[PDB]
Amino acid sequence: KKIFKPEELRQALMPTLEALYRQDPESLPFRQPVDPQLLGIPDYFDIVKNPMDLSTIKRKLDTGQYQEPWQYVDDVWLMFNNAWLYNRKTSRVYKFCSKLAEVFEQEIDPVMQSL
Numbered sequence: 001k002k003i004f005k006p007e008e009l010r011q012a013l014m015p016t017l018e019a020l021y022r023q024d025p026e027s028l029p030f031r032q033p034v035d036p037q038l039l040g041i042p043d044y045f046d047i048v049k050n051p052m053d054l055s056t057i058k059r060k061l062d063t064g065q066y067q068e069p070w071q072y073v074d075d076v077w078l079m080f081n082n083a084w085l086y087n088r089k090t091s092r093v094y095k096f097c098s099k100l101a102e103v104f105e106q107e108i109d110p111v112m113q114s115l
C-alpha cells in the first residue's frame with residue numbers, strides 16, 4: 001500500500017487550506033471550532049455529530065493525522081456538510097459555506113491530480 005509521508009501531505013495540501021482561510025468575509029465563522037454556548041446555539045452538537053473547522057484540519061496536517069489525501073478532503077467536506085445541515089439557506093454561514101466550497105474545488109483539483 002502506498003504511503004504518503006506526513007510532511008509531503010502537509011506541503012501539498014496546506015496551500016488549499018490557506019486559500020480557504022484567506023477568504024474574507026466567508027471563512028471567518030469556520031476559522032475556529034464551533035462553540036455552541038458562545039454562539040447561542042446549545043443544540044449544535046445534537047444536530048452535528050462530528051464538528052469540524054479550519055483550525056482542526058490545520059492541526060491534523062501539522063500533526064500528521066491523515067494517512068491519505070482523501071481523508072483531508074473528507075474533513076473539508078465534513079465542515080461544509082455540517083454548515084449546510086445546521087443552517088438555513090438564507091443565512092450567512094450557509095452562503096459563506098457555499099463560497100468556500102467553490103474556492104476549495106478550484107484549489108484542490110490540481111493538487112489531488114498531482115498526488
Ligand SMILES: C[C@@H]1CC(=O)Nc2cccc(C(=O)NCc3ccccc3)c2N1
Pocket residue numbers: 028029030034039041082083086087092093
Ligand atoms: C459555523 C458556526 C456554526 C454553524 O453552523 N452555525 C452558526 C449558527 C449561529 C451563529 C454562528 C456564528 O458563527 N455566528 C457569527 C457569525 C456568523 C457569520 C459571520 C460572522 C460571524 C454559526 N456559525
